[PDB]
Design a protein around this ligand. Structure first.
Ligand SMILES: *C(=O)[C@@H](CC)[C@@H](CNS(=O)(=O)c1ccc(C)cc1)C(=O)O
Ligand SMILES: [Ca+2]
Length: 240
């Protein structure tokens, strides 16, 4: 996240780090949201490569032991069946990961609250993106989890010609676009937390930013709209 601030250690306990095995170690590649003790919601584009993945819950600093982390392998990957790698703009950028073991909940590890199905936020709704993605366009990943306030940009504005045009669909949420704050590579898959009726809920799954760069004026970060996929999510969880 570009233009973010370090999150407090226990602010976003559903945020997970999705990592892939790289030689003798592990490398962060995307975020995700813990939605069941053994299920993670992330972006389908994060699991397009045939890599070995693990999820880290209760993570704060990627390069140091925080003494709060739980490490778990990904046992099954279910990508939305309409997802197409060649077309992120078509949408369906969502996937569910069944964890090899159920994680233990505590103040650093909690399930993400999902919105009711069909919920659409009013323009300019208050949301925060969180993640360890690049802190600058063509930069490096953050060491500590970052957060940035990114107000939503409704579909009418977001899909307008000055913004994203036809690239944005109504199955997505746009947020930000101020030219200073945004998601960036490595934040994909993570949550967009929006305050609704006093409770933060995960309304988006980070999906894409402009090819021009991360923090680009009028190119708000684009997220899969979680509330469009509630029955899909429940169907997967129930049949697996
Ligand atoms: C997500 O991080 C997104 C910006 C918010 C990225 C794409 N996701 S990624 O950087 O994880 C990705 C890109 C390509 C591959 C092969 C793997 C990972 C974006 O550039 O829109
Ligand atoms: Ca750590």
């Amino acid at each position: 996240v570009v233009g973010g601030t370090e999150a407090q250690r226990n602010s976003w306990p559903s945020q997970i780090s999705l990592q892939y095995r790289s030689g003798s170690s592990w490398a962060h590649t995307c975020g995700g949201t813990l939605i069941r003790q053994n299920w993670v919601m992330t972006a389908a584009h994060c699991v397009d490569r045939e890599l070995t993945f693990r999820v880290v819950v209760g993570e704060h600093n990627l390069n140091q032991n925080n003494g709060t982390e739980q490490y778990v392998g990904v046992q099954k990957i279910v990508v939305h069946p309409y997802w197409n790698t060649d077309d992120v703009a078509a949408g369906y950028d969502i996937a569910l990961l069944r964890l090899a073991q159920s994680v233990t909940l505590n103040s650093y590890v909690q399930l993400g609250v999902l919105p009711r199905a069909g919920t659409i936020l009013a323009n300019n709704s208050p949301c925060y993106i969180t993640g360890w993605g690049l802190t600058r366009t063509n930069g490096q990943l953050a060491q500590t989890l970052q957060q940035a306030y990114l107000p939503t940009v409704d579909y009418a504005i977001c899909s307008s010609s000055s913004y994203w045009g036809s690239t944005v669909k109504n199955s997505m949420v746009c947020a930000g676009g101020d030219g200073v704050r945004s998601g960036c590579q490595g934040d994909s898959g993570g949550p967009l937390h929006c305050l609704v009726n006093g409770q933060y809920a995960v309304h988006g799954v980070t999906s894409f930013v402009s090819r021009l760069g991360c923090n680009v004026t009028r190119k708000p970060t684009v997220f899969t709209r979680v509330s469009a996929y509630i029955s899909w999510i429940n169907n997967v969880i129930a049949s697996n």
